[PDB]
Amino acid sequence: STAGKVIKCKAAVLWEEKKPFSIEEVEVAPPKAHEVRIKMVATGICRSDDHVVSGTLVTPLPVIAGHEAAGIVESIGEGVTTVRPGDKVIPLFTPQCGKCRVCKHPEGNFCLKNDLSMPRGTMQDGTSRFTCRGKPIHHFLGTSTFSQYTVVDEISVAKIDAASPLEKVCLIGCGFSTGYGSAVKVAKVTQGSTCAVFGLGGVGLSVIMGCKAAGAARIIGVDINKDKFAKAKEVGATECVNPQDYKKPIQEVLTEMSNGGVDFSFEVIGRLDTMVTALSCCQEAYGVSVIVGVPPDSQNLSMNPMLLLSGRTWKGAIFGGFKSKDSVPKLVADFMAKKFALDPLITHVLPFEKINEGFDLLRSGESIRTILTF
Amino acid sequence: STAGKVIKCKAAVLWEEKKPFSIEEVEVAPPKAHEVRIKMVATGICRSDDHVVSGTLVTPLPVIAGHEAAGIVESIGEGVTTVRPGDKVIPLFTPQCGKCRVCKHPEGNFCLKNDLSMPRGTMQDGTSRFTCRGKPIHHFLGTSTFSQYTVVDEISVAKIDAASPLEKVCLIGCGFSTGYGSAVKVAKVTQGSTCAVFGLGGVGLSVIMGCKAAGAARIIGVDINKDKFAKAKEVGATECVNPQDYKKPIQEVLTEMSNGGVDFSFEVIGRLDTMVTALSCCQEAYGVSVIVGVPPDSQNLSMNPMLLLSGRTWKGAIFGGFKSKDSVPKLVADFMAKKFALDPLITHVLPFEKINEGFDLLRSGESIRTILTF
Numbered sequence: 157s158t159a160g161k162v163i164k165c166k167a168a169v170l171w172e173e174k175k176p177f178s179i180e181e182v183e184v185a186p187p188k189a190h191e192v193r194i195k196m197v198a199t200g201i202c203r204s205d206d207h208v209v210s211g212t213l214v215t216p217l218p219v220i221a222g223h224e225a226a227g228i229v230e231s232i233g234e235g236v237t238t239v240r241p242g243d244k245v246i247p248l249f250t251p252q253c254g255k256c257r258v259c260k261h262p263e264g265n266f267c268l269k270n271d272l273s274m275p276r277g278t279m280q281d282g283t284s285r286f287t288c289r290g291k292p293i294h295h296f297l298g299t300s301t302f303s304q305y306t307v308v309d310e311i312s313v314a315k316i317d318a319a320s321p322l323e324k325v326c327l328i329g330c331g332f333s334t335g336y337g338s339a340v341k342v343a344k345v346t347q348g349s350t351c352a353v354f355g356l357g358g359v360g361l362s363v364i365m366g367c368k369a370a371g372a373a374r375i376i377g378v379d380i381n382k383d384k385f386a387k388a389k390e391v392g393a394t395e396c397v398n399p400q401d402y403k404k405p406i407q408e409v410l411t412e413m414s415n416g417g418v419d420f421s422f423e424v425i426g427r428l429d430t431m432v433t434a435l436s437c438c439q440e441a442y443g444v445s446v447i448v449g450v451p452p453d454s455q456n457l458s459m460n461p462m463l464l465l466s467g468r469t470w471k472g473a474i475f476g477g478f479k480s481k482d483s484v485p486k487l488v489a490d491f492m493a494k495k496f497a498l499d500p501l502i503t504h505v506l507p508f509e510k511i512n513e514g515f516d517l518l519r520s521g522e523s524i525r526t527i528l529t530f
Numbered sequence: 531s532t533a534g535k536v537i538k539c540k541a542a543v544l545w546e547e548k549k550p551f552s553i554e555e556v557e558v559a560p561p562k563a564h565e566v567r568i569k570m571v572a573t574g575i576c577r578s579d580d581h582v583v584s585g586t587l588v589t590p591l592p593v594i595a596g597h598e599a600a601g602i603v604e605s606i607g608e609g610v611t612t613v614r615p616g617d618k619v620i621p622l623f624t625p626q627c628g629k630c631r632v633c634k635h636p637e638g639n640f641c642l643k644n645d646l647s648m649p650r651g652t653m654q655d656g657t658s659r660f661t662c663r664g665k666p667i668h669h670f671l672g673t674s675t676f677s678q679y680t681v682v683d684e685i686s687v688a689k690i691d692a693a694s695p696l697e698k699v700c701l702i703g704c705g706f707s708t709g710y711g712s713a714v715k716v717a718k719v720t721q722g723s724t725c726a727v728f729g730l731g732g733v734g735l736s737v738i739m740g741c742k743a744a745g746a747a748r749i750i751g752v753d754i755n756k757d758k759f760a761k762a763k764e765v766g767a768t769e770c771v772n773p774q775d776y777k778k779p780i781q782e783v784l785t786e787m788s789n790g791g792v793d794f795s796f797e798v799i800g801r802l803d804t805m806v807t808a809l810s811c812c813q814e815a816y817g818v819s820v821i822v823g824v825p826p827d828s829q830n831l832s833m834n835p836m837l838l839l840s841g842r843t844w845k846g847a848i849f850g851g852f853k854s855k856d857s858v859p860k861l862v863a864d865f866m867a868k869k870f871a872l873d874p875l876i877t878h879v880l881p882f883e884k885i886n887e888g889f890d891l892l893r894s895g896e897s898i899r900t901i902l903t904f
């Protein structure tokens with residue numbers, strides 16, 4: 157019925173940094189060749205969407221943010237072969253073209269068609285499908301899910317199980333997969349190890365889930381908000397520590413509690429100082445530290461290279477190291493088979509029109525993941 | 531004949547920073563329990579010994595430096611079980627106690643008894659076996675090989691093949707093992723990969739040897755001294771580049787020549803800026819960069835954590851990651867079986883008494899390894 161036509165719908169537009177989202181009427185153009193128009197069903201509020209509002213994450217404005225979501229294909233442009241109208245799908249903020257050097261490498265996942273390194277906030281063809289008040293509105297990492305309808309490139313969408321609960325599996329579009337993969341795929345947590353997880357929001361909780369699934373014996377959660385500790389323990393943290401309770405630096409405290417440094421540490425916050433602290437708290441000769449948190453745009457950290465010369469391994473990853481199009485469908489299938497849980501991350505559910513309230517909950521420290529329904 | 535007695539012999543003592551070594555008479559005490567007194571046969575001049583002179587590497591002075599060497603056991607203290615008088619041995623600047631958490635971990639080699647993290651420059655018992663002009667002289671990483679005789683702890687010595695040529699296998703005590711292991715063990719260079727090696731001294735040449743033995747397809751040598759290029763090519767470099775020949779930063783140049791960044795990069799110099807440049811030139815999603823070079827004491831580098839967040843792996847190692855006492859004897863055995871060559875690193879041979887001349891050759895850029903004979 158709407159196939160091949162402009163759709164007029166509501167979307168949350170961010171017109172300028174540090175302002176509330178504006179629920180407005182936008183026009184969404186029909187999908188061009190190899191493009192997929194999606195009717196959104198659920199979208200999570202991730203800290204990275206708030207980074208766009210705060211200026212932490214820089215991307216051309218005005219913009220329709222949102223990148224963690226699930227929806228139903230409304231229509232497909234010419235040449236699309238991987239999804240059909242009616243299919244449940246999850247948009248991929250990291251594409252999987254399957255032809256670049258990274259897509260062909262066994263460990264790479266940061267596809268070279270990404271819109272993160274040199275952000276333009278467009279479709280792959282350099283143009284936008286969004287218009288508001290007559291003005292073109294940018295996309296966000298080829299996803300833009302804070303809208304009733306969006307249009308993505310075929311390499312930025314994956315078909316998922318037809319029976320999946322989209323108000324839950326939207327978390328596989330970012331939060332869950334990032335945390336879980338960070339532990340299980342990037343760090344490769346080992347059985348019996350000691351892990352330290354800095355930041356106990358949705359991503360940090362999914363890191364804990366992954367460490368516990370990998371058989372870690374000790375999983376130490378670190379947060380300055382102690383209200384985060386109960387849920388952290390629920391999904392696997394054996395201990396939790398608040399840096400504000402101590403008179404000495406947390407890396408010392410953690411080095412002492414792990415009898416010389418942890419096997420695996422994770423930075424899941426987004427601060428330069430906690431990135432260096434997480435590196436330091438892993439065992440100097442064989443420790444591994446993974447950066448997951450997004451740092452303030454263009455800022456450099458300072459660190460002593462002797463931390464690495466002793467033997468430490470330092471790495472970072474986008475989306476838990478998962479090749480997005482190949483893994484999203486398998487993660488949904490595993491969720492359907494009850495291999496992991498997603499309810500522990502969901503603390504609040506709000507209609508899409510209350511998006512600003514959902515961001516207020518995140519910023520106040522009260523929520524983990526707010527799921528917005530359309 | 532000398533067993534149980536103080537030995538009077540010549541040693542090169544460093545009384546103060548930035549001065550020539552002073553060839554003096556020293557008194558070497560007999561070995562205490564679990565100690566081994568070694569008659570030196572050959573010692574190489576590594577850049578790290580020059581770092582002690584320049585103040586780059588800090589350790590208590592006055593000191594007997596030198597750590598890359600081979601000699602013959604003169605006598606053993608009570609309780610020594612792993613070596614005997616007359617054995618050929620190689621002193622280990624990284625110990626292998628075999629009991630600490632690092633020694634027992636499969637991938638650790640930075641034994642907790644090392645004298646590097648908090649340098650005291652003494653034997654394991656906190657005292658020195660060296661005296662000069664009535665003053666106690668410090669040890670250097672439990673080795674101190676710029677002396678006709680030295681005393682080391684049993685965990686800092688390995689028994690090697692009785693037929694090995696000590697004027698060649700002394701390089702297994704540092705230079706060769708470090709570079710080689712950095713490629714094959716730490717980085718785990720893969721067949722068909724592209725490697726970039728910053729610094730073409732003896733350790734950088736050894737890194738090339740390990741990349742070639744791992745089957746790398748391309749091995750790009752980087753050095754501001756183009757006189758280093760011929761030998762680099764001889765041992766495996768497919769191309770060599772001098773940063774001074776270009777108008778743009780070397781990481782750009784290397785990213786362009788590897789069509790998007792190399793698989794494995796190695797910092798084998800000891801500069802903060804080349805450590806970051808080496809990291810950057812490795813492929814942003816799956817690249818691996820290994821720091822081998824020793825940076826100026828207590829200085830921090832500055833870097834953007836986005837270099838890691840895209841997927842890069844950054845690591846460092848001491849002694850190429852080898853568990854010292856288990857690996858040195860195998861390396862010598864491999865060398866005896868012609869599994870690798872050591873002659874390409876040796877450009878000059880001088881009597882011990884010309885140690886200052888040997889340091890002048892290194893500092894002028896003329897040599898790779900000068901072997902000193904006793």
Ligand SMILES: NC(=O)c1ccc[n+]([C@@H]2O[C@H](COP(=O)([O-])OP(=O)(O)OC[C@H]3O[C@@H](n4cnc5c(N)ncnc54)[C@H](O)[C@@H]3O)[C@@H](O)[C@H]2O)c1
Binds near residue numbers: 202450524
């Ligand atoms: N690499 C990726 O692919 C990817 C994917 C998703 C999110 N992220 C990033 O991961 C981070 C975490 O995301 P989230 O959605 O879980 O966010 P969140 O805001 O829900 O969680 C962060 C947690 O850090 C805690 N915290 C803040 N400052 C702290 C400090 N100084 N010390 C200790 N704890 C502190 C907060 O109390 C909070 O619980 C963000 O930076 C987000 O942008 C990266």
Ligand SMILES: NC(=O)c1ccc[n+]([C@@H]2O[C@H](COP(=O)([O-])OP(=O)(O)OC[C@H]3O[C@@H](n4cnc5c(N)ncnc54)[C@H](O)[C@@H]3O)[C@@H](O)[C@H]2O)c1
Binds near residue numbers: 824847
């Ligand atoms: N990690 C360890 O276990 C270990 C063991 C041995 C040596 N090291 C360290 O490794 C480094 C190399 O040792 P070496 O004995 O081979 O030293 P070296 O001095 O023989 O070689 C260093 C090479 O780097 C080159 N170089 C200098 N500045 C440069 C720049 N700006 N750009 C590019 N190239 C530059 C020089 O021309 C030289 O050929 C030293 O810092 C040494 O202390 C570490």
Ligand SMILES: CCCC[C@@H]1CC[S@](=O)C1
Binds near residue numbers: 223474839
């Ligand atoms: C390291 C920067 C990654 C930014 C990505 C934005 C959407 S997802 O939350 C992570």
Ligand SMILES: CCCC[C@@H]1CC[S@](=O)C1
Binds near residue numbers: 623824848
């Ligand atoms: C990272 C510092 C290691 C310094 C050690 C001194 C002797 S060997 O050259 C390496």
Ligand SMILES: [Zn+2]
Binds near residue numbers: 251253256269
């Ligand atoms: Zn790709």
Ligand SMILES: [Zn+2]
Binds near residue numbers: 205223
């Ligand atoms: Zn996200």
Ligand SMILES: [Zn+2]
Binds near residue numbers: 576578579597598704
């Ligand atoms: Zn050395």
Ligand SMILES: [Zn+2]
Binds near residue numbers: 626628632641642
């Ligand atoms: Zn040990």
